[PDB]
Amino acid sequence: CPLMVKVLDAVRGSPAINVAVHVFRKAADDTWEPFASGKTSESGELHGLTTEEEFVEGIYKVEIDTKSYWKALGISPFHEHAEVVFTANDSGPRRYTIAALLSPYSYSTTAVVTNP
Amino acid sequence: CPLMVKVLDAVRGSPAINVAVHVFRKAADDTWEPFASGKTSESGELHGLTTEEEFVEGIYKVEIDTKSYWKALGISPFHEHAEVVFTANDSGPRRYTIAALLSPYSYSTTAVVTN
Amino acid sequence: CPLMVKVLDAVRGSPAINVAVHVFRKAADDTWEPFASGKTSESGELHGLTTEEEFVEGIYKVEIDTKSYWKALGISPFHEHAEVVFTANDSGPRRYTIAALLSPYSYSTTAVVTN
Amino acid sequence: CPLMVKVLDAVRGSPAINVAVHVFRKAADDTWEPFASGKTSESGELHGLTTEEEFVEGIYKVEIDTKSYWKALGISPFHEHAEVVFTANDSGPRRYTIAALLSPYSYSTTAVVTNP
């Protein structure tokens, strides 16, 4: 699995479950093309977005639908979404974990990048 | 001043100076139109981006050019930029400060919304 | 003013007001001796804790009473407090700002060290 | 496993390996008593600190030796350590993950708390 996402909730001290995530890849014509999407599991994790073959070099955007998450919990949050934009596989194939820690008016994100 | 940005460096423990910041407002066709930009000051702050009259309700995006900042420091970054996207609302407090704390492979952002 | 503290609330998007803050300096016997304290202001800031003459090199601890803050808001917190422990050094910049961004089950802290 | 720690490095985008961690429990006499210690693995994780039987209610301090970590990487960091202090098992037994994301002049921490 070369691209996985993990989302945590800093209010409840839990995984952030059922969070929608959309991944896009920047095209030759400089638009964002749909790449993959899914929702986080009970563990806050989203696996199985892509494959090593399909996940070629490029600029990727991971959009995490944080606003829907908070509204379902009764909270009107600040952000529309959290977006993580990065170049992938520029130094050969890597495995990427995109982590995000959510609060109503804040988020933090980090990457864990490993060499297969 | 209804919209301020503050950028800090978690590696050096300092303001993040000379970081380019672009603000966009979402148009009716759902594209992003340029709205304001500047470079952070010696204190990591960017003031004067807009005015109360111009900063009407809507969806805005603040894009912070983190990659160029790290590159200037000789350090390999992960992200192309940090994007903060939010709705401006007239119901709440009048002043938005968008703060970002930068590391090469990570950033944290918060909003401080006051009167 | 060589030591400032700023505390922000990641739930409300605001300064964290009326948060108790205690500073301690590590003694030769390795116990913590009280040094300064106060409550954050309406802007989430606490100034005037010490002076340049008093703030000599050594190990200091800044304890932020996060639990009482959340309790006052009716929200169950995880931590008893947030502790920031560091060495003050004369070689570097003169002004330390300890910033903390608070959530019920999480906090982030950074140092901004300037002239 | 009722108490585990995970440490990540926000400079390198990797686990924080070989990080020393000391856990203390507040005694009846209000001192900090040693409870358990270990080091993070290649995955940035520390498991096996304690057992469900031993991990009774109390106030616990997890001290993560961040300064040694950064100095080994050639960096002179701000903090002496990162300390996470919390009451455990007050609403019955729980499993706790203490996560920390490290930078030279900053850290973030969160808890993931689950009911067995």
Ligand SMILES: Oc1c(I)cc(-c2nc3cccc(Cl)c3o2)cc1I
């Ligand atoms: O004036 C200030 C403002 I506004 C914000 C910060 C701040 N400290 C942070 C620590 C972690 C994450 C984030 Cl976003 C943070 O923002 C500090 C100062 I000084």
Ligand SMILES: Oc1c(I)cc(-c2nc3cccc(Cl)c3o2)cc1I
């Ligand atoms: O398995 C994981 C666990 I548990 C925690 C995180 C985590 N990502 C963070 C980003 C910012 C701040 C903090 Cl404390 C974070 O904690 C990541 C993974 I992968």
